[PDB]
Amino acid sequence: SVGIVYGDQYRQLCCSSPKFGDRYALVMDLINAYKLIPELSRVPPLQWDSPSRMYEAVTAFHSTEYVDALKKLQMLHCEEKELTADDELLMDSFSLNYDCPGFPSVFDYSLAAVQGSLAAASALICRHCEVVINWGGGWHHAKRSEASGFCYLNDIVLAIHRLVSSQTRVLYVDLDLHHGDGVEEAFWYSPRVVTFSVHHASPGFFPGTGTWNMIFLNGAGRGRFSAFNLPLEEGINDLDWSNAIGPILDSLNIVIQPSYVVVQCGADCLATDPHRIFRLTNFYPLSGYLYAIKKILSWKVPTLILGGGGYNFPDTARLWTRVTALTIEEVKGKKMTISPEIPEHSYFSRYGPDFELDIDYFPDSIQKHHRRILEQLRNYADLNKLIYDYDQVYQLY
Ligand SMILES: COc1ccc(Cn2ccc3ccc(C(=O)NO)cc32)cc1
Ligand SMILES: [K+]
Ligand SMILES: [K+]
Ligand SMILES: [Zn+2]
Numbered sequence: 050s051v052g053i054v055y056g057d058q059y060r061q062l063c064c065s066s067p068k069f070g071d072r073y074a075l076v077m078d079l080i081n082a083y084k085l086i087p088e089l090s091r092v093p094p095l096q097w098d099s100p101s102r103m104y105e106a107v108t109a110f111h112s113t114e115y116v117d118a119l120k121k122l123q124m125l126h127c128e129e130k131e132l133t134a135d136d137e138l139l140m141d142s143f144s145l146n147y148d149c150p151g152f153p154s155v156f157d158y159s160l161a162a163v164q165g166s167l168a169a170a171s172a173l174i175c176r177h178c179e180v181v182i183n184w185g186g187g188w189h190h191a192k193r194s195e196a197s198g199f200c201y202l203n204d205i206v207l208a209i210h211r212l213v214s215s216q217t218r219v220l221y222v223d224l225d226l227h228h229g230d231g232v233e234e235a236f237w238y239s240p241r242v243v244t245f246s247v248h249h250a251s252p253g254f255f256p257g258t259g260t261w262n263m264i265f266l267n268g269a270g271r272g273r274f275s276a277f278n279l280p281l282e283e284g285i286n287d288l289d290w291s292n293a294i295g296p297i298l299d300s301l302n303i304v305i306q307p308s309y310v311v312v313q314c315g316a317d318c319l320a321t322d323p324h325r326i327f328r329l330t331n332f333y334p335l336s337g338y339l340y341a342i343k344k345i346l347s348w349k350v351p352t353l354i355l356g357g358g359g360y361n362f363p364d365t366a367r368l369w370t371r372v373t374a375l376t377i378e379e380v381k382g383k384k385m386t387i388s389p390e391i392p393e394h395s396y397f398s399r400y401g402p403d404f405e406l407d408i409d410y411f412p413d414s415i416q417k418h419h420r421r422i423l424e425q426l427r428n429y430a431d432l433n434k435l436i437y438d439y440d441q442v443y444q445l446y
């Protein structure tokens with residue numbers, strides 16, 4: 050079956066942040082306006098027996114003094130008085146500032162995504178679901194002791210740690226506009242979790258990693274060759290993108306033969322995202338996102354689908370709805386008919402002025418990247434004594 054994470058307390062908490070506003074509500078309601086929920090299995094957010102239990106789960110990756118800091122920051126914003134100079138210092142050393150500011154529910158908000166992506170992992174492991182979806186999750190920039198890119202808690206890292214600890218190999222696929230640095234960094238020294246991010250990279254653009262470095266870093270220790278990256282120039286469209294990641298996705302599958310696939314499905318590659326970097330759409334005659342998702346799903350490997358970036362909320366909703374519906378069809382087999390027009394629901398007016406499901410947009414370096422990545426794959430396989438037909442993989446290009 051196919052699972053979605055949601056719940057009343059959960060929705061309220063994914064909607065209390067100053068930067069993502071009510072995106073989670075727009076998304077889950079568009080999913081629900083399209084009569085998609087009955088076809089889906091509700092996966093509830095995980096809860097803990099006690100504070101100590103919550104704490105041990107989060108510090109499987111995040112440092113204790115960082116969890117302390119984030120929780121002190123929520124308390125401080127639930128008070129009216131401002132932060133002491135000493136408290137400012139504490140928060141800065143955890144980068145709890147700038148694009149990672151505090152707000153009254155910041156710890157509860159960060160914890161929720163962890164709660165959802167942990168329940169999603171658990172529903173895959175006990176084989177209740179073949180695929181689970183969590184649009185509240187996907188915060189791939191959070192580091193052990195540092196907030197970054199409005200990510201305070203790395204739900205992905207933790208959902209992944211739970212999968213490998215259930216030989217178990219996980220493929221992480223990161224379709225966001227930004228390089229999934231945190232997730233990549235977390236499994237830098239591990240071969241059982243292969244990471245692969247495709248993204249924009251250019252000077253001064255966040256975060257800075259996922260590209261040629263002062264050549265190409267790709268993992269250390271036994272983790273060597275296990276972190277993959279494809280940085281693209283700006284302006285790329287659906288088909289060029291599709292052709293850029295397609296062979297890489299197929300080859301990672303054949304070579305690695307993953308026990309689980311975790312997909313950060315960040316929506317900021319859309320043409321209508323305020324970033325205006327990539328020209329990806331949500332069209333389904335073809336959307337680069339849909340191509341990739343449907344490819345990943347044809348593999349029949351249990352799969353986690355996560356959110357991430359996306360700062361045009363109605364258009365992120367337009368994509369993630371299509372992804373949801375696609376997943377339902379490629380897993381259960383039954384056809385999903387989606388009206389081209391946005392159905393009436395409480396957020397309908399946000400989708401104006403034309404109320405269409407399609408977003409409103411009109412549509413060499415890569416081969417030197419394909420060749421470099423094929424070599425890296427071969428080195429990965431050789432290091433990890435994996436059997437595979439070199440030619441069969443080579444043909445995919
Ligand atoms: C162009 O419009 C924008 C809207 C929101 C933001 C927010 N923002 C600032 C720094 C930063 C880093 C990473 C991400 C992200 O989506 N990671 O997945 C978002 C970020 C910037 C521009
Ligand atoms: K990415
Ligand atoms: K790795
Ligand atoms: Zn992003």
